[PDB]
Design a protein around this ligand. Structure first.
Ligand SMILES: O=[As]c1ccccc1
Ligand SMILES: [Ca+2]
Ligand SMILES: [Ca+2]
Length: 328
Protein backbone atom coordinates (compact mmCIF):
# COMPACT_ATOMS: atom_id res chain seq x y z
CA UNK A 1 0.00 0.00 0.00
CA UNK A 2 0.79 3.68 0.31
CA UNK A 3 -1.14 3.27 3.56
CA UNK A 4 1.62 2.07 5.94
CA UNK A 5 1.77 3.84 9.32
CA UNK A 6 5.02 5.28 10.67
CA UNK A 7 7.30 2.50 11.90
CA UNK A 8 6.94 2.39 15.74
CA UNK A 9 10.16 3.63 17.46
CA UNK A 10 10.46 0.33 19.35
CA UNK A 11 10.67 -1.36 15.97
CA UNK A 12 13.29 0.94 14.26
CA UNK A 13 16.16 -0.54 16.21
CA UNK A 14 15.11 -4.14 15.38
CA UNK A 15 14.56 -3.27 11.70
CA UNK A 16 18.08 -1.72 11.64
CA UNK A 17 19.24 -5.27 12.35
CA UNK A 18 17.32 -7.23 9.81
CA UNK A 19 19.18 -8.44 6.67
CA UNK A 20 19.05 -5.63 4.09
CA UNK A 21 17.96 -8.06 1.32
CA UNK A 22 14.88 -9.01 3.37
CA UNK A 23 14.01 -5.36 3.71
CA UNK A 24 14.82 -4.34 0.13
CA UNK A 25 12.76 -7.11 -1.40
CA UNK A 26 9.76 -6.99 0.97
CA UNK A 27 6.38 -6.66 -0.73
CA UNK A 28 3.75 -4.32 0.83
CA UNK A 29 3.05 -2.71 4.16
CA UNK A 30 4.17 -3.94 7.55
CA UNK A 31 1.79 -6.21 9.44
CA UNK A 32 0.86 -4.08 12.52
CA UNK A 33 1.49 -5.72 15.87
CA UNK A 34 -0.19 -5.74 19.30
CA UNK A 35 1.69 -3.85 22.07
CA UNK A 36 5.29 -5.34 22.12
CA UNK A 37 5.07 -6.42 25.75
CA UNK A 38 2.06 -8.61 24.99
CA UNK A 39 4.03 -10.58 22.40
CA UNK A 40 6.46 -12.17 24.85
CA UNK A 41 6.20 -15.94 24.46
CA UNK A 42 3.39 -15.83 21.83
CA UNK A 43 3.11 -18.05 18.77
CA UNK A 44 2.53 -15.55 15.87
CA UNK A 45 1.49 -16.36 12.33
CA UNK A 46 2.00 -13.83 9.49
CA UNK A 47 -0.32 -14.38 6.49
CA UNK A 48 1.45 -13.19 3.31
CA UNK A 49 4.83 -13.01 4.96
CA UNK A 50 6.77 -12.16 1.80
CA UNK A 51 10.55 -11.94 2.47
CA UNK A 52 9.90 -12.15 6.25
CA UNK A 53 10.30 -8.57 7.30
CA UNK A 54 7.47 -8.90 9.84
CA UNK A 55 8.29 -12.48 10.73
CA UNK A 56 11.86 -11.48 11.66
CA UNK A 57 10.64 -8.35 13.57
CA UNK A 58 8.24 -10.51 15.63
CA UNK A 59 11.01 -13.15 16.17
CA UNK A 60 12.89 -10.67 18.37
CA UNK A 61 9.67 -9.46 20.08
CA UNK A 62 8.33 -12.92 21.01
CA UNK A 63 11.69 -13.99 22.48
CA UNK A 64 13.24 -17.45 22.48
CA UNK A 65 10.14 -18.95 24.15
CA UNK A 66 7.84 -17.62 21.43
CA UNK A 67 7.60 -18.85 17.82
CA UNK A 68 6.91 -17.09 14.46
CA UNK A 69 5.46 -18.70 11.33
CA UNK A 70 5.27 -17.00 7.90
CA UNK A 71 3.06 -18.39 5.02
CA UNK A 72 3.18 -17.24 1.42
CA UNK A 73 2.64 -18.57 -2.14
CA UNK A 74 5.37 -16.43 -3.75
CA UNK A 75 8.32 -18.86 -4.40
CA UNK A 76 10.70 -15.98 -5.08
CA UNK A 77 9.95 -14.03 -1.81
CA UNK A 78 10.04 -17.26 0.31
CA UNK A 79 13.46 -18.17 -1.11
CA UNK A 80 14.78 -14.93 0.39
CA UNK A 81 12.92 -15.56 3.65
CA UNK A 82 14.19 -19.11 4.04
CA UNK A 83 17.91 -18.34 3.51
CA UNK A 84 18.11 -15.74 6.34
CA UNK A 85 16.92 -17.82 9.27
CA UNK A 86 20.42 -18.48 10.71
CA UNK A 87 21.37 -14.87 10.07
CA UNK A 88 18.62 -13.69 12.37
CA UNK A 89 18.97 -16.62 14.87
CA UNK A 90 22.44 -15.23 15.70
CA UNK A 91 21.56 -11.59 15.24
CA UNK A 92 18.81 -11.95 17.84
CA UNK A 93 19.78 -14.98 19.91
CA UNK A 94 23.63 -15.41 19.48
CA UNK A 95 23.69 -18.67 17.54
CA UNK A 96 22.70 -19.71 14.01
CA UNK A 97 20.99 -22.79 15.48
CA UNK A 98 18.54 -20.99 17.75
CA UNK A 99 15.94 -19.56 15.26
CA UNK A 100 12.34 -19.37 16.51
CA UNK A 101 10.92 -19.01 12.96
CA UNK A 102 9.81 -21.02 9.94
CA UNK A 103 8.44 -20.15 6.53
CA UNK A 104 5.72 -22.25 4.89
CA UNK A 105 4.51 -22.34 1.28
CA UNK A 106 0.77 -22.46 0.75
CA UNK A 107 -2.42 -20.56 -0.12
CA UNK A 108 -3.54 -18.63 2.99
CA UNK A 109 -7.10 -20.03 2.39
CA UNK A 110 -5.69 -23.47 3.44
CA UNK A 111 -3.04 -23.50 6.12
CA UNK A 112 -3.41 -27.26 6.73
CA UNK A 113 -1.89 -28.17 3.30
CA UNK A 114 1.12 -25.86 3.53
CA UNK A 115 4.70 -27.18 3.06
CA UNK A 116 6.99 -28.50 4.70
CA UNK A 117 4.18 -28.74 7.27
CA UNK A 118 0.61 -27.44 7.80
CA UNK A 119 -0.54 -25.32 10.72
CA UNK A 120 -2.34 -27.54 13.23
CA UNK A 121 -5.65 -26.65 15.00
CA UNK A 122 -5.55 -24.43 18.07
CA UNK A 123 -1.82 -23.69 17.73
CA UNK A 124 -1.43 -19.95 17.23
CA UNK A 125 -1.79 -17.03 19.65
CA UNK A 126 -1.75 -14.07 17.19
CA UNK A 127 -2.47 -14.15 13.46
CA UNK A 128 -1.36 -11.04 11.71
CA UNK A 129 -1.82 -9.82 8.10
CA UNK A 130 -1.83 -6.65 6.03
CA UNK A 131 -4.00 -6.13 2.97
CA UNK A 132 -4.48 -9.82 2.09
CA UNK A 133 -8.26 -10.28 2.14
CA UNK A 134 -9.47 -8.45 -0.98
CA UNK A 135 -7.27 -10.45 -3.35
CA UNK A 136 -8.31 -13.52 -1.40
CA UNK A 137 -10.02 -16.21 -3.54
CA UNK A 138 -12.55 -16.95 -0.78
CA UNK A 139 -12.89 -14.77 2.32
CA UNK A 140 -15.12 -17.15 4.30
CA UNK A 141 -12.68 -20.04 3.90
CA UNK A 142 -9.81 -17.76 4.90
CA UNK A 143 -11.66 -16.60 8.07
CA UNK A 144 -12.62 -20.20 8.89
CA UNK A 145 -8.98 -21.33 8.57
CA UNK A 146 -7.91 -18.49 10.81
CA UNK A 147 -10.40 -19.47 13.52
CA UNK A 148 -9.24 -23.03 13.19
CA UNK A 149 -5.53 -22.41 13.85
CA UNK A 150 -6.19 -19.89 16.65
CA UNK A 151 -6.08 -21.21 20.20
CA UNK A 152 -8.71 -20.20 22.75
CA UNK A 153 -7.96 -16.69 23.84
CA UNK A 154 -5.96 -16.18 20.56
CA UNK A 155 -6.64 -13.27 18.18
CA UNK A 156 -6.68 -12.09 14.62
CA UNK A 157 -4.96 -8.75 14.67
CA UNK A 158 -4.98 -7.41 11.14
CA UNK A 159 -5.32 -4.41 8.75
CA UNK A 160 -7.31 -4.26 5.59
CA UNK A 161 -9.37 -2.06 3.31
CA UNK A 162 -13.14 -1.88 3.78
CA UNK A 163 -15.98 0.10 2.23
CA UNK A 164 -18.91 1.96 3.61
CA UNK A 165 -21.37 0.47 1.07
CA UNK A 166 -21.65 -2.49 -1.36
CA UNK A 167 -19.58 -2.03 -4.51
CA UNK A 168 -21.43 -2.51 -7.88
CA UNK A 169 -20.84 -5.54 -10.13
CA UNK A 170 -18.90 -3.30 -12.54
CA UNK A 171 -16.57 -2.11 -9.75
CA UNK A 172 -15.96 -5.65 -8.59
CA UNK A 173 -14.89 -6.74 -12.17
CA UNK A 174 -12.44 -3.92 -12.80
CA UNK A 175 -8.77 -5.12 -12.92
CA UNK A 176 -7.15 -1.84 -11.62
CA UNK A 177 -9.60 -1.52 -8.72
CA UNK A 178 -8.99 -5.17 -7.96
CA UNK A 179 -5.17 -4.92 -7.89
CA UNK A 180 -5.47 -1.75 -5.73
CA UNK A 181 -7.32 -3.92 -3.13
CA UNK A 182 -10.45 -1.79 -3.59
CA UNK A 183 -12.53 -3.97 -5.97
CA UNK A 184 -12.64 -6.93 -3.60
CA UNK A 185 -13.39 -4.78 -0.52
CA UNK A 186 -16.32 -5.77 1.76
CA UNK A 187 -18.95 -3.42 2.94
CA UNK A 188 -18.26 -3.32 6.65
CA UNK A 189 -21.61 -4.88 7.77
CA UNK A 190 -21.05 -7.68 5.32
CA UNK A 191 -17.54 -8.17 6.76
CA UNK A 192 -19.03 -8.34 10.27
CA UNK A 193 -21.60 -11.05 9.26
CA UNK A 194 -18.94 -13.08 7.35
CA UNK A 195 -16.45 -13.04 10.18
CA UNK A 196 -19.25 -13.94 12.61
CA UNK A 197 -20.12 -16.88 10.42
CA UNK A 198 -16.47 -18.02 10.67
CA UNK A 199 -16.67 -17.97 14.47
CA UNK A 200 -15.68 -14.42 15.55
CA UNK A 201 -18.53 -12.90 17.34
CA UNK A 202 -16.93 -9.60 18.50
CA UNK A 203 -14.98 -7.34 16.19
CA UNK A 204 -12.94 -4.68 17.99
CA UNK A 205 -11.86 -1.59 16.17
CA UNK A 206 -8.17 -0.70 16.87
CA UNK A 207 -7.70 2.13 14.32
CA UNK A 208 -9.09 3.50 11.09
CA UNK A 209 -7.76 5.79 8.33
CA UNK A 210 -9.37 7.18 5.15
CA UNK A 211 -8.47 5.72 1.77
CA UNK A 212 -8.93 8.05 -1.24
CA UNK A 213 -9.72 7.16 -4.80
CA UNK A 214 -8.93 10.32 -6.75
CA UNK A 215 -8.35 8.99 -10.32
CA UNK A 216 -11.58 10.21 -11.98
CA UNK A 217 -11.85 7.12 -14.16
CA UNK A 218 -11.85 4.61 -11.27
CA UNK A 219 -13.90 6.97 -9.07
CA UNK A 220 -16.64 6.70 -11.69
CA UNK A 221 -16.98 2.98 -10.86
CA UNK A 222 -17.32 3.81 -7.14
CA UNK A 223 -18.79 7.34 -7.16
CA UNK A 224 -19.88 7.94 -3.56
CA UNK A 225 -18.04 5.01 -1.87
CA UNK A 226 -15.88 5.88 1.14
CA UNK A 227 -13.06 3.39 1.68
CA UNK A 228 -11.23 2.85 4.93
CA UNK A 229 -8.11 1.22 6.15
CA UNK A 230 -9.12 -0.56 9.34
CA UNK A 231 -7.15 -2.41 11.89
CA UNK A 232 -9.38 -4.81 13.83
CA UNK A 233 -8.84 -7.43 16.50
CA UNK A 234 -11.13 -10.42 16.60
CA UNK A 235 -10.58 -12.74 19.64
CA UNK A 236 -11.36 -16.43 19.58
CA UNK A 237 -13.06 -16.84 22.93
CA UNK A 238 -15.69 -19.56 23.51
CA UNK A 239 -17.91 -17.48 25.87
CA UNK A 240 -18.22 -14.27 23.83
CA UNK A 241 -21.84 -13.24 22.94
CA UNK A 242 -23.11 -11.27 19.95
CA UNK A 243 -24.02 -8.44 22.39
CA UNK A 244 -22.09 -6.41 25.06
CA UNK A 245 -23.68 -7.22 28.39
CA UNK A 246 -23.10 -5.82 31.81
CA UNK A 247 -22.28 -8.22 34.61
CA UNK A 248 -21.05 -5.50 36.92
CA UNK A 249 -17.34 -6.21 36.24
CA UNK A 250 -14.18 -4.13 36.43
CA UNK A 251 -10.78 -4.80 34.94
CA UNK A 252 -7.51 -3.36 36.22
CA UNK A 253 -4.35 -3.18 34.18
CA UNK A 254 -1.51 -4.23 36.49
CA UNK A 255 1.29 -2.53 34.44
CA UNK A 256 4.34 -4.17 32.89
CA UNK A 257 3.69 -3.70 29.20
CA UNK A 258 3.45 0.08 28.99
CA UNK A 259 2.18 3.09 30.84
CA UNK A 260 -1.38 2.09 29.88
CA UNK A 261 -3.06 -0.63 27.93
CA UNK A 262 -5.24 0.33 25.00
CA UNK A 263 -7.46 -2.62 24.12
CA UNK A 264 -9.46 -0.90 21.37
CA UNK A 265 -11.00 2.53 20.58
CA UNK A 266 -13.55 2.08 23.48
CA UNK A 267 -11.37 0.74 26.26
CA UNK A 268 -8.19 2.29 27.64
CA UNK A 269 -6.83 0.87 30.91
CA UNK A 270 -4.48 3.16 32.89
CA UNK A 271 -1.97 1.44 35.21
CA UNK A 272 -3.74 0.31 38.49
CA UNK A 273 -7.13 2.15 37.90
CA UNK A 274 -10.28 -0.07 37.72
CA UNK A 275 -12.26 0.42 34.48
CA UNK A 276 -15.86 -0.82 34.20
CA UNK A 277 -16.18 -3.49 31.42
CA UNK A 278 -18.89 -5.53 29.62
CA UNK A 279 -18.59 -9.34 29.97
CA UNK A 280 -17.19 -9.89 26.45
CA UNK A 281 -14.29 -7.57 27.29
CA UNK A 282 -13.78 -9.35 30.73
CA UNK A 283 -13.76 -12.73 28.98
CA UNK A 284 -11.29 -11.48 26.33
CA UNK A 285 -8.92 -10.35 29.08
CA UNK A 286 -9.37 -13.48 31.18
CA UNK A 287 -8.99 -16.08 28.41
CA UNK A 288 -6.28 -14.37 26.28
CA UNK A 289 -2.58 -13.93 27.03
CA UNK A 290 -3.62 -10.49 28.37
CA UNK A 291 -4.71 -12.24 31.67
CA UNK A 292 -1.08 -12.03 32.79
CA UNK A 293 -1.24 -8.21 33.13
CA UNK A 294 -4.74 -7.74 34.47
CA UNK A 295 -7.05 -8.17 37.42
CA UNK A 296 -10.65 -8.90 36.43
CA UNK A 297 -13.42 -8.90 38.97
CA UNK A 298 -16.07 -11.64 39.27
CA UNK A 299 -19.39 -11.53 37.39
CA UNK A 300 -22.32 -10.32 39.46
CA UNK A 301 -25.98 -10.53 38.33
CA UNK A 302 -26.81 -9.29 34.81
CA UNK A 303 -27.56 -5.58 34.71
CA UNK A 304 -28.72 -5.26 31.02
CA UNK A 305 -26.72 -3.81 28.18
CA UNK A 306 -23.36 -2.34 29.07
CA UNK A 307 -23.51 1.46 29.42
CA UNK A 308 -20.54 2.39 31.79
CA UNK A 309 -18.47 3.92 28.95
CA UNK A 310 -18.49 7.51 27.69
CA UNK A 311 -19.11 6.17 24.19
CA UNK A 312 -21.58 3.32 25.00
CA UNK A 313 -24.11 4.23 22.22
CA UNK A 314 -21.33 3.86 19.61
CA UNK A 315 -20.04 0.77 21.39
CA UNK A 316 -23.40 -1.00 20.53
CA UNK A 317 -23.80 0.52 17.05
CA UNK A 318 -23.13 -1.11 13.72
CA UNK A 319 -19.45 -1.30 12.75
CA UNK A 320 -20.08 1.08 9.90
CA UNK A 321 -21.02 3.85 12.42
CA UNK A 322 -18.09 3.11 14.69
CA UNK A 323 -15.61 3.47 11.79
CA UNK A 324 -17.11 6.58 10.20
CA UNK A 325 -17.48 8.39 13.55
CA UNK A 326 -13.95 7.46 14.66
CA UNK A 327 -12.17 8.78 11.53
CA UNK A 328 -13.85 12.16 12.36
AS1 LIG B 1 -3.39 -4.87 -0.91
C1 LIG B 1 -3.01 -3.16 -1.76
C2 LIG B 1 -3.26 -1.95 -1.08
C3 LIG B 1 -2.98 -0.74 -1.73
C4 LIG B 1 -2.46 -0.73 -3.03
C5 LIG B 1 -2.23 -1.94 -3.72
C6 LIG B 1 -2.52 -3.17 -3.09
CA1 LIG C 1 2.70 -9.10 4.31
CA1 LIG D 1 -20.69 6.92 4.80
Amino acid sequence: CKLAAAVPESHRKILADIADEVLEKFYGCGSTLPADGSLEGATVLDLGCGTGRDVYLASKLVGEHGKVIGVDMLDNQLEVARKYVEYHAEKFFGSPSRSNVRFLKGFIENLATAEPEGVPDSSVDIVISNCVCNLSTNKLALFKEIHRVLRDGGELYFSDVYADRRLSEAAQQDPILYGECLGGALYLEDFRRLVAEAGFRDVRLVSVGPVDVSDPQLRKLVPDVQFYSCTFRCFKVATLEATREDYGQSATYLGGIGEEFKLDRFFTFPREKPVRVDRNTAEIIRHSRLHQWFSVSAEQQHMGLFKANDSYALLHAPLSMQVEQLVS
